[PDB]
Structures are given as structure tokens and as C-alpha cells.
Ligand binder design. Structure first.
Ligand SMILES: *[C@@H]1O[C@H](CO[C@@H]2O[C@@H](C)[C@@H](O)[C@@H](O)[C@@H]2O)[C@@H](O[C@@H]2O[C@H](CO)[C@@H](O[C@@H]3O[C@H](CO[C@H]4O[C@H](CO)[C@@H](O[C@H]5O[C@H](CO)[C@@H](O[C@@H]6O[C@H](CO)[C@H](O)[C@H](O)[C@H]6O)[C@H](O)[C@@H]5O)[C@H](O)[C@@H]4O)[C@@H](O)[C@H](O[C@H]4O[C@H](CO)[C@@H](O)[C@H](O)[C@@H]4O)[C@@H]3O)[C@H](O)[C@H]2NC(C)=O)[C@H](O)[C@H]1NC(C)=O
Ligand SMILES: *[C@@H]1O[C@H](CO)[C@@H](O)[C@H](O)[C@H]1NC(C)=O
Lengths: 215, 215
């Protein structure tokens, strides 16, 4: 269980994208966790298609929200997910334009993190790879974040509303933290990433609804 | 376990190639099995590089022969194998031009089939996918094969000499058989493939030295 890991360094994370006015955070987190596991099983890093999931996960609400665990199950039961090149993101709802030949990755299921167990998520990021998580992104202080180890005592520990991708953890200026990839472009945060308070009583509900895919 | 399986049908096999005057049959067999497992885990069929292995598997003899098991072990310790596009075949010895960004597949080790146990190999083809094997391909009846279920009682069950890739099994005109991909071009055999006698006492030593990579 290392003290510090940054899966960007290790070639596991695709470039930050911008979801725009579509509410498709859940699909960027899914594709992000699956990108990491495809890299771990293979040697190649390949950006997979959130649009694939936006259009096709019927048990989700397209641009109006969804879950990662059900996204994973779609790609499992669907037996594949297309690549972003095959199925580029357009940020608006449409019919399932899935094409089974442009298939770039598969899924054998998912496992969920124990709710409220930051010590557990620390091991999971280190062992598995980038972990899909859900947070409270509703406060103004989180939307306009740019630097430092985010910590807001009004961040709701009990309810979440926005999906991101945990890509590491560590410590900066003596404050332990999670490293997150958001889907708000590189203009947001620190080149699209942030550092959130860690081991501080589940700040913003990071482990309230976390999962990762099996491959 | 099915009566019949044909991984050509399922998109698991790349097109037949021609090894030429280089003795690198073992490398096409290896890459073929790695192609099969990459398709099973990810869904994409991508032709991998035998030249990668010819140049870089130091414990093999390059164009002068080699083993699939030692090829697999290279890709494990090397942490990757390049794609045929990145590292095209030239049918001649040269220096290890491996490029880790062109990594297209990895290996976690290998497993061997019980020697002389066709019933076991049948399970592996059905369960795992295409299995690298070695046979006696030295006789004229095999060189001039074009159609039907190959069977020569003079085929050496004890000393194999040429690597192929078992890509299925089944039955034709009441003769149980293996389906193999050879590396002698499409002009040989039935568009580069053949059918070898199965459950006829380990014909041509088909199970004498069979393995597949772990991923
Ligand atoms: C080892 O293998 C490496 C990988 O091989 C490739 O992969 C597979 C498919 C193989 O089968 C090969 O066929 C491939 O070559 C080899 O590395 C490749 O080498 C090529 C030649 O040196 C490179 O192409 C040349 O470079 C550009 C094209 O740029 C490409 O870059 C990436 C590649 O994935 C991508 O676009 C992104 O580029 C930036 C990547 O960092 C990215 O930067 C981000 O920018 C953000 C802000 O904008 C932000 O700040 C981020 O922080 C920042 O990182 C960009 O934003 C893009 O998103 C595209 O694929 C893109 O195509 C091009 O200029 C060159 O064209 C020349 O061609 C002609 C001359 O004939 C003429 O027009 C000009 O002279 C022109 O200059 C050329 O295409 C390729 O990029 C490179 N790929 C990688 C991944 O490294 C390597 O050579 C091999 N080495 C050896 C020794 O074998
Ligand atoms: C699916 O994608 C492939 C390219 O990978 C393309 O050749 C094929 O026509 C596509 N199928 C459609 C558009 O139905």
C-alpha cells in the first residue's frame, strides 16, 4: 500500500474532456475507469466512448444523469463498448448508434467500494487502478476550484450529485488528498484535475457511491 | 463443451501470412494465440508482431527456430508486444526494435495443455481460445495438402518440427478434426488452413507441445 500514486505518471489516464451542457458526468467516469483497466490488461491507453454509454444505457437517463455501476453492467451485458474515435462525443441525446465492430474494450462485471471507508478506497486505487466515484459538486467553491487541497465543511457528506474519476492519492503541504479527473475541460482546476481532502471524514461523499470495472 | 467451434467464424483470427524462408513458424503461432486472447479480453482483433518476437526473444534462435512458451515469457517480462503495423514482418533477423508505446498486448505467463491429451486440448480451445501447438509438418502429404482431413500414419507423433495455431475443432464427413492456421500463405492448403485428424492417437504430435498465453 504505497504512500503516493498518480496514474497520470504511469500512462493510465486519457486527456481531460469537456462535457459541456450535457449532464453526462457518469459516462466520463465509467470510460475513465475502463480506460485504466484496458491499459492494465493490455499495454495501450485508448479513450473509450462516453457517448456510447450516454446513448445506450437504457436504465440511465442519457444527458440527464446515470450511474457508473449500471454503465459497467451495460458494457458487460452488451459485450463491448466502442472507442471515442469510433463513437465521438457530441454532448446531446440520441438513439443508440452502437457499432459492435468498432468495439475496443469489454467488461466482466464490477465491484463496489465499502461505503464510507477511505482506507479501503486508498488500497483499491493502488491495487486496481483509477476508481469511479461520486461527489458533491454542487457548491460554488467546488465548481470554481483552481488550487490546493479542497476542503469545505459545508460539502455534503451524506448526498452526492456528480461523477468523477479518482486517479491517485498522496500528500501536499502536509494535507493528505485524493487526485481527481473531472470532465470540465483543462480550464477547470489544475489542468482539469484537483486535490480533495482525504481521511477527513469522507469529504464531499467520495466513497458514498464508488465502483470500478472488472476485466 | 461444444461439439464444434471455429474461431475464424468469431473474428478471433487474423489473415494467413507467409513466413517465407525464415524459420519463424513459432512466432506466428505465438502472436496468433496472443491475438486470440486480446480479442477475448477486449473485443478488438489486431494483428500482432511476430517480427517483434523473432528479433527480441533472445532465448530463441530467431529465424532458426524457437518455442512458443519462451516467446510468451518474453512478452511477460518485456511487459508488452507490438502490433504488426508498428513492427512489420520482414522474414530476416535484425536487432530488437521493440517500442513500448506501440505496446498492443501483454502476458501474465502461460499454461500448458497435458501432453498427449486431446480431450484436454479440446477443453482449452473451447474454453480459452486459439492454442499454439507444434506438429510434424515435414511430410509431402502435408506440404501438398489442399482439402479434407489430413491423416498420415507416418506423421511423427514423437518429434514435432513446425508451429501452427489451433483455431477450432469439429467434424467433417464423420472424421473428427482440429482446425489449424498455418504460416505458409493462402496458396497452401485451404486458404492457408487445414484440418488434422483428431482423436486418432495424437496425430502429428498435436498435443505434444501446446500452450497459450495468460493475460
Ligand atoms: C515509437 O512508437 C510511437 C508511437 O507510434 C504510433 O502509434 C502506433 C499507431 C504505431 O503503429 C505508429 O504507426 C505510430 O507512429 C512513435 O510516436 C509517434 O511518432 C510519430 C512520429 O514521430 C508522431 O507523429 C508526429 O507528430 C505530430 C502528430 O501528433 C500526434 O500526437 C498525439 C499522438 O497520440 C495525438 O494528438 C495530440 O498530440 C499531443 C500529445 O501530447 C497533445 O498534446 C496535448 O495538448 C493539450 C493542449 O492542446 C494539453 O496541454 C496536453 O498536456 C498535451 O499533452 C495534442 O493536444 C493532441 O491531442 C495525435 O495522434 C497526433 O497525430 C505531427 O506533427 C507529425 O506530422 C509531421 O508529418 C509530416 C511529415 O511527413 C508533415 O506534415 C510535418 O513535418 C509534420 O510535422 C507526426 O504525425 C506521433 O505523435 C507519435 N505518437 C506518440 C504517441 O508518441 C515513435 O516515433 C516510435 N519511436 C521509435 C523510435 O520507434
Ligand atoms: C462500424 O465501424 C467500422 C469501422 O471500424 C465500419 O467499417 C462499419 O461500416 C461500421 N458499421 C456501420 C456503420 O454499420
Amino acid at each position: 500500500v504505497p504512500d503516493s500514486i498518480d496514474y497520470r505518471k504511469k500512462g493510465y489516464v486519457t486527456p481531460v474532456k469537456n462535457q459541456g451542457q450535457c449532464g453526462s458526468c457518469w459516462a466520463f467516469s465509467s470510460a475513465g475507469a475502463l480506460e485504466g483497466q484496458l491499459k492494465k490488461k493490455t499495454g495501450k491507453l485508448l479513450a473509450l466512448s462516453p457517448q456510447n454509454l450516454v446513448d445506450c444505457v437504457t436504465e440511465n437517463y442519457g444527458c440527464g444523469g446515470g450511474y457508473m455501476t449500471t454503465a459497467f453492467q451495460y458494457v458487460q451485458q452488451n459485450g463491448g463498448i466502442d472507442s471515442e474515435d469510433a463513437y465521438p462525443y457530441v454532448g446531446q441525446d440520441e438513439s443508440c448508434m452502437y457499432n459492435a465492430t468498432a468495439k475496443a474494450a469489454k467488461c466482466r462485471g464490477y465491484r463496489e467500494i465499502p461505503v464510507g471507508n477511505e482506507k479501503a478506497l486508498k488500497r483499491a486505487v493502488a491495487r486496481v487502478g483509477p476508481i469511479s466515484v461520486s461527489i458533491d459538486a454542487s457548491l460554488a467553491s467546488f465548481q470554481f476550484y483552481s488550487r490546493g487541497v479542497y476542503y469545505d465543511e459545508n460539502c455534503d457528506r451524506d448526498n452526492v450529485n456528480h461523477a468523477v474519476l479518482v486517479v491517485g492519492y498522496g500528500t501536499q503541504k502536509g494535507s493528505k488528498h485524493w487526485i481527481i479527473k473531472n470532465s470540465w475541460g483543462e480550464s477547470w482546476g489544475n489542468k482539469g484535475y484537483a486535490l480533495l481532502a482525504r481521511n477527513k471524514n469522507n469529504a464531499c461523499g467520495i466513497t458514498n457511491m464508488a465502483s470500478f470495472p472488472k476485466m
